């Protein structure tokens, strides 16, 4: 079945782990933010 796409997500994230090219949490869009989150991002930009 289509589970080869989720197996490819595992292969992509392991290829990036063998390369060592990742965030400090090891994990791999402003339009979608709440008005509060826009205010917090504006507060981070100031």
């Amino acid at each position: 079945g289509l589970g080869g796409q989720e197996e490819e997500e595992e292969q992509r994230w392991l290829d990036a782990l063998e390369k060592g090219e990742l965030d400090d949490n090891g994990d791999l869009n402003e339009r979608l933010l709440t008005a509060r989150q826009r205010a917090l991002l504006q507060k981070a930009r100031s």
């Binding site: 782990l17 060592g20 990742l22 400090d24 949490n25 090891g26 994990d27 979608l32 709440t34 509060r36 989150q37 917090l40």
Partner: protein, 106 residues
């Protein structure tokens, strides 16, 4: 003709039910007519915001049915929800994906 306190104030949250819960919870012998409107609006805002973030996390994981995991992603990403909910636990929510640094290979 009547109009519900909820629909008059413009909330989807149940102002009448909040009024009874404040009156019958013995939080006081007297409850102000504004108090359950104001409280319903805050419960609504919190419920709208925690759901908006969960729905975004669900669609970003290509599912349309919100399940406890999506709430746990929403709550633990945004630090003001993570401070509000703090120490509470979500049934079958799991944990926010986080391989700690230094363990992460070189």
């Amino acid at each position: 003709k009547a109009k519900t306190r909820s629909s008059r104030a413009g909330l989807q949250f149940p102002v009448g039910r909040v009024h009874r819960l404040l009156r019958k919870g013995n939080y006081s012998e007297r409850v102000g007519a504004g108090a359950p409107v104001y409280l319903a609006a805050v419960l609504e805002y919190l419920t709208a915001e925690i759901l908006e973030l969960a729905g975004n996390a669900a669609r970003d994981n290509k599912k349309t049915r919100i399940i406890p995991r999506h709430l746990q992603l929403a709550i633990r990403n945004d630090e003001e929800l993570n401070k509000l909910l703090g120490r509470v636990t979500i049934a079958q929510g799991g944990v926010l994906p986080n391989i700690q640094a230094v363990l992460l290979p070189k």
